[PDB]
Design a protein around this ligand. Sequence first.
Ligand SMILES: O=C(N[C@H](CO)[C@H](O)c1ccc([N+](=O)[O-])cc1)C(Cl)Cl
Ligand SMILES: [K+]
Ligand SMILES: [K+]
Ligand SMILES: [K+]
Ligand SMILES: [K+]
Ligand SMILES: [K+]
Ligand SMILES: [K+]
Ligand SMILES: [K+]
Ligand SMILES: [Mg+2]
Ligand SMILES: [Mg+2]
Ligand SMILES: [Mg+2]
Ligand SMILES: [Mg+2]
Ligand SMILES: [Mg+2]
Ligand SMILES: [Mg+2]
Ligand SMILES: [Mg+2]
Ligand SMILES: [Mg+2]
Ligand SMILES: [Mg+2]
Ligand SMILES: [Mg+2]
Ligand SMILES: [Mg+2]
Ligand SMILES: [Mg+2]
Ligand SMILES: [Mg+2]
Ligand SMILES: [Mg+2]
Ligand SMILES: [Mg+2]
Ligand SMILES: [Mg+2]
Ligand SMILES: [Mg+2]
Ligand SMILES: [Mg+2]
Ligand SMILES: [Mg+2]
Ligand SMILES: [Mg+2]
Ligand SMILES: [Mg+2]
Ligand SMILES: [Zn+2]
Lengths: 113, 119, 122, 53, 207
Amino acid sequence: MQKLIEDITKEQLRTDLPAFRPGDTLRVHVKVVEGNRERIQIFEGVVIKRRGGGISETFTVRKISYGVGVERTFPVHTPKIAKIEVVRYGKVRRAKLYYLRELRGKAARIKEI
Amino acid sequence: SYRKLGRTSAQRKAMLRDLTTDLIINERIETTETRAKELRSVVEKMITLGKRGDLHARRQAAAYIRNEVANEENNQDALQKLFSDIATRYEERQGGYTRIMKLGPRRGDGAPMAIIELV
Amino acid sequence: MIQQETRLKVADNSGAREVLTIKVLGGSGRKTANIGDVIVCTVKQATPGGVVKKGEVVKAVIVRTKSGARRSDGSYISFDENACVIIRDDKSPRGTRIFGPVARELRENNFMKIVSLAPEVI
Amino acid sequence: AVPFRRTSKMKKRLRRTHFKLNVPGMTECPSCGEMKLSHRVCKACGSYNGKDI
Amino acid sequence: TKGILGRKIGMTQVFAENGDLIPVTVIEAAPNVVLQKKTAENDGYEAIQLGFDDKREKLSNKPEKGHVAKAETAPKRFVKELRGVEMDAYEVGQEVKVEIFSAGEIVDVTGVSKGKGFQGAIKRHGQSRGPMSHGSRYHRRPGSMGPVDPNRVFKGKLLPGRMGGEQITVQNLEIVKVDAERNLLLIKGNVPGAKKSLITVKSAVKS
RNA sequence: GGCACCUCGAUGUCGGCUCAUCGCAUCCUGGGGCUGUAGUCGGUCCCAAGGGUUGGGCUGUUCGCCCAUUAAAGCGGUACGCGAGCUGGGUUCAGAACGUCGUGAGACAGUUCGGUCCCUAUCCGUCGCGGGCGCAGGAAAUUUGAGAGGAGCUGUCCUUAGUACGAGAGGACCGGGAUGGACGCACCGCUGGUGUACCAGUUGUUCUGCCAAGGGCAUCGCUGGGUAGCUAUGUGCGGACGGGAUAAGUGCUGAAAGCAUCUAAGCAUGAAGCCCCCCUCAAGAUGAGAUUUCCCAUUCCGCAAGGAAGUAAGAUCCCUGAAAGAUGAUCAGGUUGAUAGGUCUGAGGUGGAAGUGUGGCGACACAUGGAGCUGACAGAUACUAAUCGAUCGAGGACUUAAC
Ligand SMILES: O=C(N[C@H](CO)[C@H](O)c1ccc([N+](=O)[O-])cc1)C(Cl)Cl
Ligand SMILES: [K+]
Ligand SMILES: [K+]
Ligand SMILES: [K+]
Ligand SMILES: [K+]
Ligand SMILES: [K+]
Ligand SMILES: [K+]
Ligand SMILES: [K+]
Ligand SMILES: [Mg+2]
Ligand SMILES: [Mg+2]
Ligand SMILES: [Mg+2]
Ligand SMILES: [Mg+2]
Ligand SMILES: [Mg+2]
Ligand SMILES: [Mg+2]
Ligand SMILES: [Mg+2]
Ligand SMILES: [Mg+2]
Ligand SMILES: [Mg+2]
Ligand SMILES: [Mg+2]
Ligand SMILES: [Mg+2]
Ligand SMILES: [Mg+2]
Ligand SMILES: [Mg+2]
Ligand SMILES: [Mg+2]
Ligand SMILES: [Mg+2]
Ligand SMILES: [Mg+2]
Ligand SMILES: [Mg+2]
Ligand SMILES: [Mg+2]
Ligand SMILES: [Mg+2]
Ligand SMILES: [Mg+2]
Ligand SMILES: [Mg+2]
Ligand SMILES: [Zn+2]
């Protein structure tokens, strides 16, 4: 942590985001610009990963969509995200839930806390 | 970065633990300069645990220090000396518990030797 | 990252179930295709009944990949599988329906018909 | 690969221009006055930086 | 031509107004000083000599102290010339600050690339390996030295040797932001060199 | 093929791999003339070697055929380039077998299965890196650029315009703009990889007397993550605008030759090519350049010439190290010093320590408490180590000219 790099990028840090961890289920309200209109598309899913620090911090959300697993990685402080709602806090035992990529159904379920 | 000292990971750990306990017991050992330079950081980190003094700090030190007799008269282990005598001596000192002094090369292999001692 | 010999699932009802990539189109020595890119492929597994048959050389557009795609906003999308859709030379799907989600990148590469038929577009 | 020709006395000597020892990095000991290596304890009297070691 | 000397601090990223995420290099360039004006009369060519980064008096010498005396500044760690600048704009002792540049401006960035030490032909020259199996005893070697007929290897047969530590220019990088208070340029993308290395930022030669 | 001139006290032979380099009789791209050139396409010849010139199936193959691409899938030379660089499938030792020939032993440009590829680089050469001296005083920087290297590729789409052209079918030049492929350079913020002194889980056994908590060994025991660093498949950027002189070609004016004629005099235009422009190295460029700044004319012999000795500016030895590194070198520092370690505070990583309490018969769970632990990352802090010292390093030749 160069203090200088933090100080330059402190402006663009979002203050409105909830505290979440890997394992928690989010609704990420993603601003989609399909030509003229700016609509919101909700990506609901489990946080599998959160890495980096400051403005470079990213997080990955996973969902099954029509029988196909989909992951979306976002910068934490991206202005493309309108809102993050924490749907459900998870009970997991690690920072990276890459083991969920193999699993499906009852095996893939996480205990609520 | 850190030095490998011509040893595998396990051999190096074992050697640094041996040297760490040797310095705690003797307060002053002669070794190769490059061994002494690596030993500084390891020993000073052990003294930091000693100065903390709590059970958690003692168990961390116990994972590193060898089960060797520091004082045969009192029946004091090296771990006990670290948490008793060494920790007390360096209560007010903030880092820099050791010093290296260079001796010059030994005969058999020209290896640059050094004294490392507790300050 | 799809290359020659990569097998893909077929995300449509054209008949083909699995294809094998013969060629990544769009330049000499082009090794890798990603979402939106067209590939030449042979049908290795086909549904016994449908239009497209086993052993046919066909063109297909890649609609999902494991490697995924980066976006200008610094966000990424990835799928659990590599999937394509069999197309004609005018980029229209040979099958009538699309199965599973597809990437938004198909809109950029002028595959509006596939995007319109897709159940979800992420 | 073997020497195609033997090396002359001259060429051997030219090669050994740099094959040479340096004089030790030595200074007079301020305690006892014998030469010591700079930054090393004096072997003769055991002193360093005006302190008996 | 405009220019300034700075140090490379490191890389981060910035969200643009449209929401794109731009990777940036941070260059800290505390005010440069014009130490000398070279002229066609005296020197045979036109240039300004920029000094950057105030050195301690101990680390300086009498030659250095006398050279910076006209500019009325402390001895500078890094000294470089800019050519193709407007000579009348500058005067000896004048400060050159980061706010010569503005956001959107296209720049070339010169630095010394990171050292890699002694490297083989695969890494250094991007050459292909021989097979790793099928009986091969040819993995990371540099290939045939050439044909028989010359009885010699041609110049430019590329071989192992010291890699990196070379002056590199990256052209046509965009200034994202200019922090005049902190003396920073934020430049889009990546530039040559280690953190703390000297970076020259010049107005783009092809612009 | 002919010949039998070098090599039989050995010049390794096909194909592939690695690395290329050259020629141009040009495959693509650039510029043109003619056309049985309407357009779009082509044909043919001229200039042009700058760059580019694919992945597969079969076969030991080269070749070839085929599949699928491509702007294009050029043809040749370099010991049919390259085995002290690699391979060894084929050919071309010893085994065995088939067909065939031979009474037979055996044999076969017939086939078949199996069959040891050695070498520590002396010299030149090539790629890097130091030391020396030189460059008419000794130094510290900044430099000019003789000269050298690098780069040089190209698609598609949109628009111009459904315009020109054409009976339709189809369908431009020239010019704008957008975005790729391949290639290159840099860099790790992002996506990932690795990460053997980071964190966690876990098996067996063994040790720290026992419990609890830990250590050893088992590929880092295994498994799940992962910091810095190093990285590509990741990101950024590049081959842009031009200028000068030309090639083929097109001319203008113009006679020799009342005309005509691009040529004889004279004047133009005109290629991805040439020379620049762009990037890098570069004054050992002995032709040793330039600019700025610093030191300053010392003491001895010796008749002088010259030599010797202390030093100046400055540099080094030695030491702390890394952004550097095989070693030298380079770079940051050496006490009015943050150079490294430690320490303190952080970042990031891991993911909830031990102890204690509570619940449970128990495995275990929950709380205390995003805890504990934490290589390399950031900042602060002289606590430790960069001690004391020593060595090296000018006094500036002569001539002429101008002041
Ligand atoms: O016989 C050898 N080479 C000779 C020189 O002695 C020569 O180079 C050669 C090579 C191949 C060849 N052939 O294929 O018929 C004939 C002679 C040894 Cl390398 Cl085995
Ligand atoms: K022979
Ligand atoms: K060419
Ligand atoms: K061989
Ligand atoms: K040879
Ligand atoms: K020779
Ligand atoms: K990275
Ligand atoms: K010179
Ligand atoms: Mg984190
Ligand atoms: Mg082990
Ligand atoms: Mg011991
Ligand atoms: Mg290869
Ligand atoms: Mg091998
Ligand atoms: Mg020759
Ligand atoms: Mg012949
Ligand atoms: Mg004869
Ligand atoms: Mg012979
Ligand atoms: Mg020709
Ligand atoms: Mg050959
Ligand atoms: Mg050879
Ligand atoms: Mg018979
Ligand atoms: Mg025969
Ligand atoms: Mg030149
Ligand atoms: Mg020369
Ligand atoms: Mg990082
Ligand atoms: Mg990484
Ligand atoms: Mg137990
Ligand atoms: Mg044992
Ligand atoms: Mg000079
Ligand atoms: Zn002494």
